[PDB]
Design an enzyme around this catalytic site. Structure first.
Site, short mmCIF file in Angstrom:
data_model
loop_
_atom_site.label_atom_id
_atom_site.label_comp_id
_atom_site.label_asym_id
_atom_site.label_seq_id
_atom_site.Cartn_x
_atom_site.Cartn_y
_atom_site.Cartn_z
N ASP A 154 -3.25 -4.15 -52.98
CA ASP A 154 -4.68 -4.43 -52.90
C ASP A 154 -5.10 -4.86 -51.50
O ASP A 154 -4.94 -6.03 -51.13
CB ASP A 154 -5.13 -5.46 -53.92
CG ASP A 154 -6.51 -6.00 -53.60
OD1 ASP A 154 -7.50 -5.23 -53.71
OD2 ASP A 154 -6.59 -7.17 -53.21
N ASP A 210 -4.91 -13.35 -49.96
CA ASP A 210 -4.16 -13.98 -51.06
C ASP A 210 -2.98 -13.09 -51.45
O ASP A 210 -2.98 -12.47 -52.51
CB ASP A 210 -5.08 -14.25 -52.26
CG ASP A 210 -4.44 -15.14 -53.33
OD1 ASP A 210 -3.45 -15.86 -53.06
OD2 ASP A 210 -4.95 -15.14 -54.47
N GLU A 262 -13.71 -8.03 -60.26
CA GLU A 262 -14.39 -7.21 -59.26
C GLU A 262 -14.15 -5.70 -59.42
O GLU A 262 -14.96 -4.90 -58.95
CB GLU A 262 -13.99 -7.64 -57.85
CG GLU A 262 -14.60 -8.96 -57.41
CD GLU A 262 -13.57 -9.94 -56.87
OE1 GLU A 262 -12.44 -9.96 -57.41
OE2 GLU A 262 -13.90 -10.68 -55.92
N1 1L7 Z 1 -5.55 -2.30 -55.75
C1 1L7 Z 1 -5.31 -2.70 -56.78
C2 1L7 Z 1 -4.98 -3.24 -58.16
C3 1L7 Z 1 -5.43 -4.40 -58.63
C4 1L7 Z 1 -6.71 -5.05 -58.16
C5 1L7 Z 1 -6.67 -6.21 -57.33
C6 1L7 Z 1 -7.89 -6.78 -56.92
N2 1L7 Z 1 -9.07 -6.26 -57.29
C7 1L7 Z 1 -9.13 -5.19 -58.07
C8 1L7 Z 1 -7.97 -4.52 -58.54
C9 1L7 Z 1 -4.10 -2.41 -59.04
O1 1L7 Z 1 -3.65 -2.83 -60.10
N3 1L7 Z 1 -3.78 -1.06 -58.61
C10 1L7 Z 1 -2.91 -0.27 -59.47
C11 1L7 Z 1 -2.25 0.78 -58.53
C12 1L7 Z 1 -2.71 0.86 -57.23
C13 1L7 Z 1 -2.16 1.77 -56.38
C14 1L7 Z 1 -1.15 2.58 -56.86
C15 1L7 Z 1 -0.69 2.48 -58.17
C16 1L7 Z 1 -1.24 1.58 -59.02
#
Ligand code: 1L7
Length: 254
Positions: A208, A192, A56
């Site tokens: 997330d 989840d 997504e």
């Molecule tokens: N949201 C999120 C992520 C995965 C995700 C899950 C579900 N759907 C899409 C992406 C993710 O890895 N974020 C990395 C991150 C986020 C915030 C700060 C530093 C690093």
């Protein structure tokens, strides 16, 4: 002999062959313009490497600016191509902040993006540990980067055995407390919640918030119970002894 795209209008640091290739692959015409606009408005200073890939959404690092200060950012980009039925749509059930009676299904991804941003706001207001939301536009969400020096924080699952050297019981408790705040103050439930979307630096972060529902959602209570079981399952592996009913009570405050 026309240029292929306007990709080169983006400031991408360490733009060699491979970085650009990655960007070219994931960015469609519409998203590119959006990233350009966020740059021109001052939010994005320069785009960095890929942080995570997914079905997504993809997340990249960027240096940026928010409220007059430089910040390290996660730039989360929801894939614009959407199927007639996605579980993200079901996650909207009973959410009064949104009615799809005023949106075109070709732009539902913009709603997913806005919802995640507004969940981050709501969570952060409730004192849940989540990345600070900065802004969003179309399918692009900008938020606080969790980590240091362009290295994202380890997820719980990445830490694994290492958790035993950082007070793993304290970490479990930190997780529970955040689920509690999310439930009682933010009135949100992650659909989840697991070791895969909880990060740790010197405290836990839920990273997330798009995969979340409000308490009006029919599955909100099941999702919550499963979350608790997920957490217990995971933390027990590292010697933490916890009881399902106790922590469910602890989150809900019977
Ligand atoms: N949201 C999120 C992520 C995965 C995700 C899950 C579900 N759907 C899409 C992406 C993710 O890895 N974020 C990395 C991150 C986020 C915030 C700060 C530093 C690093």
């Amino acid at each position: 002999k026309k240029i292929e795209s306007y990709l080169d209008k983006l400031r991408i640091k360490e733009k060699d062959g491979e970085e650009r290739k990655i960007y070219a692959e994931v960015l469609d015409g519409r998203t590119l313009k959006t990233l350009y606009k966020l740059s021109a408005k001052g939010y994005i200073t320069a785009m960095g490497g890929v942080i995570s890939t997914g079905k997504e959404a993809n997340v990249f690092y960027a240096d940026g600016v928010f409220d007059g200060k430089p910040v390290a950012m996660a730039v989360k980009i929801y894939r614009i191509e959407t199927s007639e039925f996605d579980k993200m749509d079901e996650y909207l059930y009973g959410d009064e902040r949104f009615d799809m009676r005023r949106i075109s299904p070709k732009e539902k991804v913009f709603i997913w993006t806005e919802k995640e941003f507004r969940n981050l706001e709501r969570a952060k207001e409730a004192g849940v540990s989540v990345p600070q939301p900065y802004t969003y536009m179309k399918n692009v969400l900008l938020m606080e980067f969790i980590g240091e020096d362009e290295l994202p924080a380890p997820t719980l699952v990445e830490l694994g055995r290492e958790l035993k050297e950082l007070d793993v019981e304290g970490i479990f408790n930190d997780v529970v407390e955040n689920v509690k705040r999310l439930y009682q103050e933010a009135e949100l439930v992650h659909a989840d919640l697991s070791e895969y979307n909880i990060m740790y630096i010197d405290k836990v972060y839920f990273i997330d918030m798009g995969q979340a529902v409000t308490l009006r959602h029919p599955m909100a209570e099941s999702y919550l119970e499963r979350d608790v079981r997920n957490i217990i399952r995971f933390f027990s592996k590292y010697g933490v002894k916890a009881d399902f009913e106790e922590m469910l009570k602890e989150v809900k405050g019977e």
